[PDB]
């Protein structure tokens, strides 16, 4: 499994940027996607995919230990829709 | 909707890197995630989320052209699992 440092070293190798500049850009990528989604804005990235949000419906159930009802409210959640290039690469 | 150029301008603003260097890093980010995923490896990015692949199981389906029952092969698809920080930002 790759971590952020593994991704950073490969970003540096692919671009010619230093590992420290690559790290700044990689962190900023995640931060920018986070901010657009926090503002309720979709982020479409040609050749990769689309980051967006979706409404996860309310759920109701029971605590198996107490028998008490648990109501989980409807919530906005992040979502990613892979583009063609990314789907083709993994299939 | 934000596109890749909108994201690159914000990566430049956040890091102090030129838009040209931000563009190189943003494109390399997507390429590195794609390669890891093409190798069947997961990429965990702390404070953002995890890119991975998942197997969609072989099943019985219907041929839309003939109307007849068919056997649909298992397929590997990309997937993204948002971390806590990203979920908290959008809720």
Q: Chain A contacts of B28, Cβ < 8 Å?
A: 10-11, 14-15, 22
CATH class for domain A1-91? few secondary structures
All residues at 6 or more sequence positions from A69 whose CB lies less than 8 Å from its CB, including other chains = A60, A61, A62, A63
Q: What is the resolution of this structure in A?
A: 2.1
3-state helix, strand, coil in chain B (%, to 5): 45, 30, 25
Other C-beta atoms closer than 10 Å to the C-beta of B90 total 20
CA distance A67 to chain B (A): 28
Domain boundary assignment for chain B: 1-91
DSSP label at residue A88: H
Q: Which uninterrupted H or E stretch holds A39?
A: none
Q: Is B7 close to A33, i.e. CB distance below 8 A?
A: yes
List A53's β-bridge partners, or say none: A78
């Amino acid at each position: 499994m790759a971590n952020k440092q593994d991704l950073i070293a490969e970003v540096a190798a692919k671009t010619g940027l230093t590992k420290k500049d690559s790290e700044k850009a990689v962190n900023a990528f995640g931060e920018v996607v986070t901010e657009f989604l926090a503002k309720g804005e979709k982020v479409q990235l040609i050749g990769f995919g689309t980051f967006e949000t979706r409404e996860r419906a309310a759920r109701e159930g029971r605590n198996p230990q107490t028998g008490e009802a648990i109501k989980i409210a409807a919530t906005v959640v992040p979502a990613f829709k892979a583009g063609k290039a990314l789907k083709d690469a993994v299939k």
